[PDB]
Amino acid sequence: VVGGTEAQRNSWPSQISLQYRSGSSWAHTCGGTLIRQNWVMTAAHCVDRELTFRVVVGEHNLNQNDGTEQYVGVQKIVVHPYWNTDDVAAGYDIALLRLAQSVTLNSYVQLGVLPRAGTILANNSPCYITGWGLTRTNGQLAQTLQQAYLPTVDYAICSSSSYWGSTVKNSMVCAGGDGVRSGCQGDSGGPLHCLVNGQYAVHGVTSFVSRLGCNVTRKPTVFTRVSAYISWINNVIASN
């Protein structure tokens, strides 16, 4: 998250850190959203590689004991069957991870609430992106969970020529684009939390930014629109 501020440790308890094994250690690669005690919603591109993944729930500082973490292996990965890794602009950047164990809920570990199917936010709706991704373009990961205020940019504006043109699809949510604040690498798969009727819900799964860089004016961060995938998500959880 570029231009973010440090999240309070109990503000976004469905955020997870998706990590892969590297040697005798684990490296954060992506975010995700806990949506069931044994299911995480993340971006399909996050699990393109044939790695060993784990999820950490109740994580705040990647590199320090918080006293609240639960570490759990990924037992099954269900990528959207229409996903194509060399066409992120096609969409379908969404995947569900079944955990090897059901995690325990507490103030630090809670299910993310998802929007109702079909729901589209008004232009400039209030949202926060959260994650441990780079804090600058070609920078380094955040040690502590970051949040940045990233109002939505609706499909008409974001699919216009000045913005993303035909690269963005209506199955995506755009947010930000102010040149200062953005998602960045390592935020992929994590949530966009948008305030609706007084409740935050996860409307977006972070998918991509500009090849030019993370905080690029008129290149808002692009997210998979969760409310386009509610039936998919329910079908997968019900079948697995």
Which of Br ion, Na ion, ligand [Xe], none does 187 bind, CB closer than 5 to 8 A by kind? ligand [Xe]
Which of Na ion, ligand [Xe], Br ion, none does 66 bind, CB closer than 5 to 8 A by kind? Na ion
187 binds ligand [Xe], rule: CB under 6 A = yes
Beta carbons of 151 and 220 less than 8 angstroms apart: no
Write out the H or E segment, with its range, that includes residue 158: helix 155-158
> How far is 78 from 211, CA to CA, in rounded Å?
27
Provide the mask over 58-87, with x wherever binding to Br ion is found by CB under 5 A and - wherever it is not.
------------------xx----------
Kindly list the strands in the beta sheet with 127-131, ordered across the sheet, starting from the edge strand earlier in the chain. Answer: 5-6, 146-149, 127-131, 191-196, 199-208, 221-225, 172-175, 152-153
Q: Choosing from 17, 125, 159, 188, which is the catalytic residue? A: 188
In 43-181, the DSSP E strands lie at 53-57, 70-79, 95-99, 127-131, 146-149, 152-153, 172-175
Least distance between ligand [Xe] and beta carbon 118 (Å): 25
Query: By C-beta, is 37 or 167 nearer to Br ion?
Result: 37
Q: Give the residue numbers of the binding site for Ca(2+).
A: 59, 61, 64, 69
Active site residues: 45, 93, 188
Q: Which residues bind ligand [Xe] (CB under 6 A)?
A: 183-185, 187-188, 206, 208-209
